[PDB]
Curated annotation (Swiss-Prot), chains A, B:
The modification N-acetylalanine is found at A1. Residues 4-134 form the Galectin domain. Keywords: Acetylation, Extracellular matrix, Lectin, Secreted. It comes from Rhinella arenarum (Argentine common toad). The lineage of its organism: Eukaryota, Metazoa, Chordata, Craniata, Vertebrata. This is Galectin-1. Homodimer.
Length: 134, 134
C-alpha cells in the first residue's frame, strides 16, 4: 500500500526469473517480496528483517499455504542498509528458487509446490522501482 | 477487458512516469495499456489497433468511468509492427498524460479526473518484459 505493489498474471514459469529494483524507506523495520498463487498461498515469502519479530539483520524465508505459514528458513547474509536501493533476482526452477543479490551473494530455497507458473507477486515495505522478467 | 499483467498500488504521482516494455505478438489484432483506479475506471485506455473494431492501424485513447467509455481521441501516428517489441512511456501531469514512443513520436491525452496518484495499471495483448517508474 504505502510501499506494496501487487502484480497479478505474472506468469513466471520454470527456468525463468524476475528481478525487482526498489528502495528501502528509512522508517522500515523490514521488507518482503512474495511469490505465489494469491494472497493466501506463497511459494516464497522473502523477508529481510532489520529489527522485526526479534530478528535483527536477518533474512527469513518461508512459504504460505492457506494463510498458514510454513517452516521458516533463515540466512546469515544480509547485504541491505536502510535508505539504500535493492536489487534482488528470483530464479524459478522446478526443484528450487535461487535468490541472487547485486552484491554477488546467493542462496536457494526449496520449491514446496511445483506450479506450472507463478501468477502472483507482491512487495511489502519496498518502494518499487522496476520489475523485469526474462 | 484487461487480461494480461495487472499492477495495483502502482500509485504513479504527478510529475512521474511509467515505462512499459514488451513484445507485440506476431498475430496481434491490437493491444492496450490502462491507467486508472481499477478495472472499471480508467484515466487512460491506450488501444493500438492493428485490425480491430473496423479500425486498421489506428490508436484510440479514451477514459472510462464505472464501465462507461467517454469520448475517443484518435491519433494519426501508428509506430507499431506486429511481432516486434514495444517501449512506451506514460508521463502523468495533472492536466494531461503525455504518451511517448521510443521512435520519438509523442502526443498527449487530457486528464478528465484528477487523481492524487494513479493506483492501477493493466496490459492487454502485450507480452510483458519490464515496468519501470521514475
Ligand atoms: C524464531 C521464530 O519462530 N519466529 C517466528 C516469526 O518469524 C513469525 O513471524 C511471521 O513470520 C512470517 C514468515 O514465516 C512472516 O514474515 C510474517 O510476516 C511474520 O509475522 C511469528 C508468527 O508466526 O512467530 C515467530 O515469532
Ligand atoms: C468509430 C467508432 O466510434 N468506434 C467505436 C469503438 O471504438 C468502440 O470500441 C470500444 O472502444 C473503447 C475505446 O474508446 C475500447 O477500446 C473498447 O474496448 C472498445 O470496444 C465501440 C464500443 O464502445 O463504439 C464504436 O464502435
Amino acid at each position: 500500500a504505502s510501499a506494496g505493489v501487487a502484480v497479478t498474471n505474472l506468469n513466471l514459469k520454470p527456468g525463468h526469473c524476475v528481478e525487482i529494483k526498489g528502495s528501502i524507506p528509512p522508517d522500515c523495520k523490514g521488507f518482503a517480496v512474495n511469490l505465489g498463487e494469491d494472497a493466501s498461498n506463497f511459494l516464497l515469502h522473502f523477508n529481510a528483517r532489520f529489527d522485526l519479530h526479534g530478528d535483527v539483520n536477518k533474512i527469513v524465508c518461508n512459504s504460505k499455504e492457506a494463510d498458514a505459514w510454513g517452516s521458516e528458513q533463515r540466512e546469515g547474509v544480509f547485504p541491505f542498509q536502510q535508505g539504500a536501493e535493492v536489487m534482488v533476482c528470483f530464479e524459478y526452477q522446478t526443484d528450487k528458487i535461487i535468490i541472487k543479490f547485486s552484491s554477488g551473494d546467493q542462496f536457494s530455497f526449496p520449491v514446496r509446490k511445483v506450479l506450472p507458473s507463478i501468477p502472483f507477486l507482491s512487495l511489502e515495505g519496498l518502494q518499487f522501482k522496476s520489475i523485469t522478467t526474462e
